[PDB]
Amino acid sequence: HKILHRLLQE
Amino acid sequence: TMSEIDRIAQNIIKSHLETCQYTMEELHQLAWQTHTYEEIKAYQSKSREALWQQCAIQITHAIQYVVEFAKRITGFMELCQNDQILLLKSGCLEVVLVRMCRAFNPLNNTVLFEGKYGGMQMFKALGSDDLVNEAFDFAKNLCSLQLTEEEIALFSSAVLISPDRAWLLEPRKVQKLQEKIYFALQHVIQKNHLDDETLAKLIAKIPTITAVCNLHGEKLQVFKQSHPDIVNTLFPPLYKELFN
Numbered sequence: 001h002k003i004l005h006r007l008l009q010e
Numbered sequence: 011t012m013s014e015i016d017r018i019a020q021n022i023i024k025s026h027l028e029t030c031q032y033t034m035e036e037l038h039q040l041a042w043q044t045h046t047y048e049e050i051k052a053y054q055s056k057s058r059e060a061l062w063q064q065c066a067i068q069i070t071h072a073i074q075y076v077v078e079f080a081k082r083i084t085g086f087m088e089l090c091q092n093d094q095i096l097l098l099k100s101g102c103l104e105v106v107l108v109r110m111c112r113a114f115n116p117l118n119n120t121v122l123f124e125g126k127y128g129g130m131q132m133f134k135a136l137g138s139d140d141l142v143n144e145a146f147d148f149a150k151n152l153c154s155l156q157l158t159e160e161e162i163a164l165f166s167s168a169v170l171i172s173p174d175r176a177w178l179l180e181p182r183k184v185q186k187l188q189e190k191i192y193f194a195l196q197h198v199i200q201k202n203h204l205d206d207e208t209l210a211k212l213i214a215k216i217p218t219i220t221a222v223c224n225l226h227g228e229k230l231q232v233f234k235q236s237h238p239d240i241v242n243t244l245f246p247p248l249y250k251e252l253f254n
């Protein structure tokens with residue numbers, strides 16, 4: 001879940 | 011501790027207000043705007059792939075706001091990132107579905123889509139009236155409860171923070187927070203809904219919410235069969251990541 005992970009880390 | 015319940019409630023309520031595409035005010039001013047007969051026809055003249063693409067973009071847009079919603083809920087960010095992902099992956103659409111009721115008009119059974127309100131015939135090209143009808147029925151029934159933004163904020167957070175999702179590593183931790191959320195929701199409901207059954211009627215809707223979202227997944231899987239290239243190269247990457 002790369003994208004979802006990125007958004008949470010923003 | 012009542013004080014902890016109140017801090018959790020304020021946090022979630024505030025997150026909700028800062029993470030909706032349209033504030034409640036902006037919606038009151040949009041509910042009078044409705045797609046014309048011409049515009050409705052244009053939507054119906056769309057190819058199934060074209061409209062699916064449009065809907066996937068809108069859903070993804072709404073899902074992104076739910077992520078922002080979750081990120082601002084202190085109790086949610088305290089869970090292990092693994093359970094955070096699991097909760098979001100399994101409930102983002104369910105939260106979107108709940109949030110849709112905010113932009114639904116039960117007077118004429120229309121919903122806000124691409125700037126104006128339109129009926130279910132607007133989605134004819136999707137070739138999934140069963141899904142559209144279940145989505146609209148849900149929204150209509152929820153709207154009948156006349157929830158306030160605080161209640162929608164809290165209830166939507168409870169739908170997202172579910173200790174019952176499969177694969178969760180710390181379900182007890184999730185359960186403890188959901189319990190506090192519901193406790194908060196129960197108190198907030200009293201300020202409005204005299205007598206009620208409200209909290210109970212809301213909780214009884216949990217399975218229906220999941221049912222609608224699973225149907226969405228079902229329709230998408232068949233859509234992928236017929237149009238693989240559209241899903242893999244035209245749908246928002248997050249939408250593909252979450253549902254395919």
Ligand SMILES: CCCCCCCCCCCCCCCCCC(=O)O
Nearest residue numbers: 065068069072106107110142145226
């Ligand atoms: C509300 C999400 C659950 C999936 C519904 C299945 C399809 C139903 C017809 C299409 C409705 C418009 C797209 C969904 C987005 C609704 C709300 C929003 O734009 O924030």
